[PDB]
Design a binder for these strands. Sequence first.
DNA 1: CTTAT
DNA 2: GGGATAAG
DNA 3: CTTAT
DNA 4: GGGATAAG
Lengths: 242, 242
Amino acid sequence: TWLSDFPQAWAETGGMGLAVRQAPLIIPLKATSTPVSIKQYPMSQEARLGIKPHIQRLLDQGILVPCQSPWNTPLLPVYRPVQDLREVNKRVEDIHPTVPNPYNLLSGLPPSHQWYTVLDLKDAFFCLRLHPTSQPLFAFEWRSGQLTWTRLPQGFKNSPTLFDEALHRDLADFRIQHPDLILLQYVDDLLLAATSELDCQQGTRALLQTLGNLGYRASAKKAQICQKQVKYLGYLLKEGQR
Amino acid sequence: TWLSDFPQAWAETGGMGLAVRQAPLIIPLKATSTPVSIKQYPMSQEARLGIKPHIQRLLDQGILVPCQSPWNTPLLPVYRPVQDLREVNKRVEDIHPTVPNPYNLLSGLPPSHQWYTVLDLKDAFFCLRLHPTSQPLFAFEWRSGQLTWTRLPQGFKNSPTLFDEALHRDLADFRIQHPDLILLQYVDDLLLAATSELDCQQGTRALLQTLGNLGYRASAKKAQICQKQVKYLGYLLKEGQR
DNA sequence: CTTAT
DNA sequence: GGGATAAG
DNA sequence: CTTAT
DNA sequence: GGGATAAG
């Protein structure tokens, strides 16, 4: 099956990802920024007990580490943690947004290619390491002491663009080696298109092999493999329509 | 004095005006209009007693007359009567607004003419008769029976423009007979300008003579006669400035 | 008094 | 959207 | 919890 | 202008 033949490529079997070819990211601050330290508003026991097993799993995975930082932003009770990074985002230098909008992205899908595979990458931002100099930016309090992220965090304003650019670099060779395949990238949402079912099969095997090798992980549960009709970015792609 | 020499021209001495050269005005309705009859909301005794001597004076002057009309609009308690003519105005055909705005009107005052007389005409709209066919438009209730206006009423949307146009017709000959005078008309607010005090004096006498003869009446109390500096349309005209 | 802004 | 406001 | 719309 | 709302 597709699962057993690519155990490294699937999140279900290959473990948490880590983009091994990507240098740990340095996050430049705006020219005038200084650290901001916001007090953690006290969390109810109910919310703390809800968040706790997630924090422990992230610590075990090395995605969170203890630290002491002049930066601090609060965790919200939503349970699983959401960080209010708005004051950090204001202090980080802006980058040009290079993620295309889905409508324009789908224009690059010609009617000759009608065999589709759709993959979504699991915990995509966590696959990108943060440089130790930038890790303290994202610190928060956990009860006492601070923790921070060693990977690109949720809620950081530049994570979608940085991830899209990183995966484009890592898949550039795949594109060159398979010039007859169409590969659309929308951050962690991927579409591969081919002319024949065989070509889609061969291309999907190469893409999964490459993704796992690079340290990314796709969701086996949600994968749509070598279908004539798939759901991608909120569209139903059928008959070459939409 | 200016008062004693022109007893017909001043409202204080000449009685209520009546523009004897102007045909009674016919007020055209919009193509689809039918009469509207709005119930008089009951008025307090205090407001009725306040309004009463004004109604009696207007009846004595012939400016109000009894009538029966399919039109009716309410009187408001403000005492002296104000009519809510909004539903009548909506049903009357629009006319082009030809009254100039004061800023543009004052542009026509050259620096050569710096001797000024300012007159304001008293009860100006009441000087214009309404044709009997149009009188029922403006009916209201007075306690029981209806009254209506035999002269152009306050609150009617076209009264300023119709009055301005009427007085322009009545003063056209005055302008031709005094080509060296500047005469600005803003509805009932008049400015006469001349080069010398004598010319202003002579021109003011001719203008008052003509106004009284035509049936208009100026306020002696407010008249500014042959001054180098006057208040007109909210401006202070001094040094040829403003 | 109701009604446009 | 509504109540404070100005105006007929 | 705070805060932009 | 403020309270209901969505989002970090």
